[PDB]
Design a protein around this ligand. Structure first.
Ligand SMILES: Cc1cc2nc3c(=O)[nH]c(=O)nc-3n(C[C@H](O)[C@H](O)[C@H](O)COP(=O)(O)OP(=O)(O)OC[C@H]3O[C@@H](n4cnc5c(N)ncnc54)[C@H](O)[C@@H]3O)c2cc1C
Ligand SMILES: Cc1cc2nc3c(=O)[nH]c(=O)nc-3n(C[C@H](O)[C@H](O)[C@H](O)COP(=O)(O)OP(=O)(O)OC[C@H]3O[C@@H](n4cnc5c(N)ncnc54)[C@H](O)[C@@H]3O)c2cc1C
Ligand SMILES: Brc1ccc2cc[nH]c2c1
Ligand SMILES: Brc1ccc2cc[nH]c2c1
Lengths: 411, 411
């Protein structure tokens, strides 16, 4: 009946709003005001594919569906090693159903407002152990949904599920107005720069209206690990254009007139992919359950964290409702996570962690073959809505050849 | 707009009813009358877990929810090698949400009636190539949902996805009244007889009311491959009791007064697990798409075929609706299957095919440990609602030990 959530983010607010609609009392702790979120720095590029969007629709939370531009496909390009300014791989495929990117600076504050209107108890505090000890005495279940916040480290890192202990990419975001729209359909335009990094770009909705989000990922120490000397929004926009001019001149043609959406429409950072154990034990001996990025944190290279957050909150909501009047004990907590991990997130995580490493030959062959086998390009693109569908053919050479043949037979 | 389906079974009727509700015209071919199905031989033990049941509920097709007894857990027993009449493993765990078994002799005819009432065009014919050639000219998509019927062999067997080319178990069913109900909760009572076979029993609903279904699976050539000399319903009931008396005397105690529900409440047969390619090309060059057991046929040992059929028809329905006015071409057909297979059925199939082979030591250790680690028994039982959750720990020794420890830590 009474549920506490620490962290008013994507997963926490989605879960809390779903619980309020199911008749629960919900207490939520936020460490920021809605307006400070709206006007602060961007946090994500939040490209959500149709399955995730549908979870929001089923809860009545798709408040920006008509205003947010759709992302209608996925494109992949690789620079040509010899031919200057050209591409050796350049293909695209349409998504079976649109994706959408609604700036968390819009969504989270609006969902905070809705949470209050629907009877939630919003408490404004940077929560720590004392708040978790208090919550665990007055609530039937307490979840930690604090994303990358320091309190997420209460949960023990799971070494076996975490192959990396260091960041594998240097990240940056740039929200811009003025970019030439993609024709004849919008897409996530992926640009893979061998041994250097990746640039992704797609339309989105932010606090000043429709835009495009530039996403940069650089191999640490390399030419796209280039944000440390950037100290002003103007320097950040300049650096963004320098990457395109240097590595993706075909995308620079779309950017002759770009401007930041706002001075806080920029981000630079990095983190190590990490999986954690879901049950944390407080000094009192009482227990809390971690949600979404607290327990499974992937590098953004595959565009999956928000998708994972919506699917994780959906799985946890269903588990809570199915438990009914039963106690939310450690066993129940652990099984709830296990269903998320073994059923889904282990495959998103293995796929993303593989793609962070240098691509093996059979992967380069897949990417080339997709350009000449449209069913394979379509399988690649739509796999982003459910990355389980990449296994076993993406990771294994022999299986990749079998799947290429399957796709070729229906081309 | 116009869809044809050959085979009025679980998957075909579920899909057809979902398409009619979405505004499509649907033509369906049945090779039997509803009454001949109601009064004919049983076809399945159709134990459906909550995710599958929920697919039926979301379509308004759970017409027997209140009359059908619930199956509330899963139990596992193994005879003791030394101690006579005793068990060395004997444990149970509650399902997070109930399962239900509604005799296909009840469900399929009732869904056939509903299909007509909702505007479907039901055509009564044993359909063959000529009907598929006619359908493919007058309909936008033609699916074959004929289960184990001979026409299913139009689709090419997929050797790489089919490790077996012979039956791995001799099957039998016995629907009975009078069995002592299980206390204190109902369950699928699994009995694993090392090197011989398996006996499963659980409550269900049939045409004469609530019953229990006895399910026998025998290693070919062994003592539970014992149905060839059975030629009358009385001999079939006697043989059923002989198995329990010989191998599971603890279950015989529940059966002192059992009687067949009806003389057609019996079945004996066998088949080779088979996966097929989903697109078949007719002599004209036009194409048809296989559904459910036509393309993925598993031995019943894991209780998954009906569950797969409901999840396959749900995936195909969603794919059709998402395709909208687009052509149902071979590429679309193949991608629809690929999403079912790579996303879900490959894992159900790998798990079931492993369990048909002799269990390795780490599996026997898992089964024993589940009896002393209740979180592990619960993970095992609830894995039947989504067998993806068994990977990778069920199939690998080191991973199994890790998961045992995870479960032990929350016990
Ligand atoms: C650069 C970048 C690009 C990305 N691009 C994409 C993309 O294109 N597609 C995609 O799907 N995902 C993407 N992601 C991932 C996605 O943004 C996250 O995975 C998602 O926000 C996770 O949701 P969450 O609920 O777990 O955490 P969050 O949404 O981060 O919410 C956690 C909240 O808790 C707050 N909090 C922290 N500590 C406390 C405390 N002690 N008390 C109270 N509140 C606290 C935090 O400030 C935050 O507001 C990207 C991530 C990054 C960094
Ligand atoms: C002994 C046994 C026990 C089982 N126990 C379980 C269990 O406990 N749980 C579980 O989930 N699953 C179980 N299954 C599996 C389950 O019964 C099937 O997987 C499920 O019925 C498959 O659905 P379907 O739509 O593909 O085919 P079906 O439901 O078999 O439908 C196919 C229909 O098409 C008809 N047909 C065939 N040829 C033609 C033609 N040319 N023209 C017209 N119609 C035609 C067939 O007669 C049939 O009516 C069991 C199966 C067996 C054999
Ligand atoms: Br597809 C896709 C969508 C968004 C992002 C952000 C980084 N990589 C991505 C891939
Ligand atoms: Br669990 C379960 C449920 C039904 C059947 C039928 C054969 N084996 C089964 C396992």
């Amino acid at each position: 009946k009474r549920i506490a959530i620490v962290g008013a983010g994507q997963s926490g607010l989605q879960l809390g709003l779903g619980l309020l609609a199911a008749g629960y009392e919900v207490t939520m702790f936020s460490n920021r005001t809605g307006e400070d979120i709206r006007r602060g720095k961007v946090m994500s590029s939040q490209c959500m594919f149709d399955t995730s969007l549908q979870i929001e629709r089923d809860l009545g939370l798709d408040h920006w569906a008509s205003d947010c531009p759709t992302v209608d496909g996925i494109g992949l390009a690789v620079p040509h090693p010899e031919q200057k300014g050209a591409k050796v791989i350049d293909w695209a495929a349409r998504l079976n159903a649109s994706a959408q990117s609604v700036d968390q600076r819009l969504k989270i504050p609006a969902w905070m407002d809705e949470f209050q209107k629907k009877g939630g108890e919003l408490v404004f505090k940077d929560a720590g152990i004392d708040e978790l000890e208090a919550c665990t005495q007055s609530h039937d279940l307490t979840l930690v949904a604090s994303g990358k916040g320091e309190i997420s480290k209460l949960f023990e890192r799971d070494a076996h599920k975490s192959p990396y202990d260091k960041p594998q990419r240097a990240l940056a975001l740039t929200y811009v107005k003025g970019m030439a729209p993609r024709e004849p359909f919008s897409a996530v335009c992926m640009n893979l720069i061998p041994g250097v990094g990746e640039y992704f770009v797609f339309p989105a909705l932010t606090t000043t209206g429709p835009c495009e989000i530039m996403v940069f990922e650089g191999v640490p120490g390399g030419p796209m690990d280039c944000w440390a000397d950037v100290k002003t929004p103007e320097e950040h926009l300049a650096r963004s254009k320098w990457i395109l001019d240097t590595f993706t001149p075909w995308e620079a043609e779309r950017c002759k007139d770009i401007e930041l959406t706002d001075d806080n429409g920029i981000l630079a950072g990095r983190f190590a992919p990490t999986v954690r154990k879901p049950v944390a034990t407080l000094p009192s001996g009482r227990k809390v359950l971690g949600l979404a990025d607290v327990v499974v944190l992937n590098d953004p290279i595959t565009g999956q964290g928000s998708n994972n957050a919506a699917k994780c909150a959906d799985t946890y909501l269903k588990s809570i409702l199915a438990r009914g009047d039963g106690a939310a004990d450690a066993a129940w907590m652990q099984q709830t996570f296990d269903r998320y991990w073994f059923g889904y997130a282990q495959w998103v995580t293995q796929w993303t962690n593989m793609l962070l490493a240098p691509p093996p030959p059979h992967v380069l062959n897949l990417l080339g073959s997709a350009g000449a086998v449209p069913p394979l390009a379509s399988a690649f693109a739509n796999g982003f809505d459910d990355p389980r569908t990449f296994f076993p053919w993406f990771a294994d050479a022999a299986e990749s050849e079998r799947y290429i043949a399957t796709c070729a037979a229906v081309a």
